[PDB]
Symmetry: C2
Subunit: 95 residues, 2 copies
């Protein structure tokens, strides 16, 4: 009974759930972009971004996840949300 096969299948299941949450996070970024456009609020606030990241680092430490790994991972997520919101603004200004 090769125990590696069952473990790799559980990791694949976990990775599919991560992708589904990434997709949901992107839908939310679109909604944020829309609300900002309706509210005339800018996309970027680098103080907001940095404070968000500090909070994620603290929540991560409760799970014993390395601060550096959390920083790098969530910097990607924040950047992707911002790119998504900016692309939304940019599309509607092309009219």
């Amino acid at each position: 009974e090769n125990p590696l096969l069952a473990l790799r299948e559980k990791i694949s299941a976990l990775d599919e759930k991560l992708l589904a949450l990434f997709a949901e996070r992107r839908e939310l970024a679109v909604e944020v972009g829309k609300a900002k456009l309706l509210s005339h609020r800018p996309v970027r606030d680098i103080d907001r971004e940095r404070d968000l990241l500090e909070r994620l680092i603290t929540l991560g430490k409760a799970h014993h996840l390395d601060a550096h790994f959390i920083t790098r991972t969530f910097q990607l997520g924040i950047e992707y949300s911002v790119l998504t919101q900016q692309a939304l603004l940019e599309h509607h200004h092309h009219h």
Copy 2:
């Protein structure tokens, strides 16, 4: 209400679920490392890592998630799992 406040709270809930899955993924990495040691597979398999990443990119595209974002995010995740498995092999000094 201010619709941005509800959206940012849903994004925070989503980020807490991501952290929980990151934690679970790390526990699984430890189990994989153990099983490899018991099975005499080497701790690193760079072909496995590269093939996994390609699969995740394709599953991501089905969710309309950018390939570059997927690539960068899962490169971090895979590296984190691998460092964990290597540390377990190295701790075989104590074992």
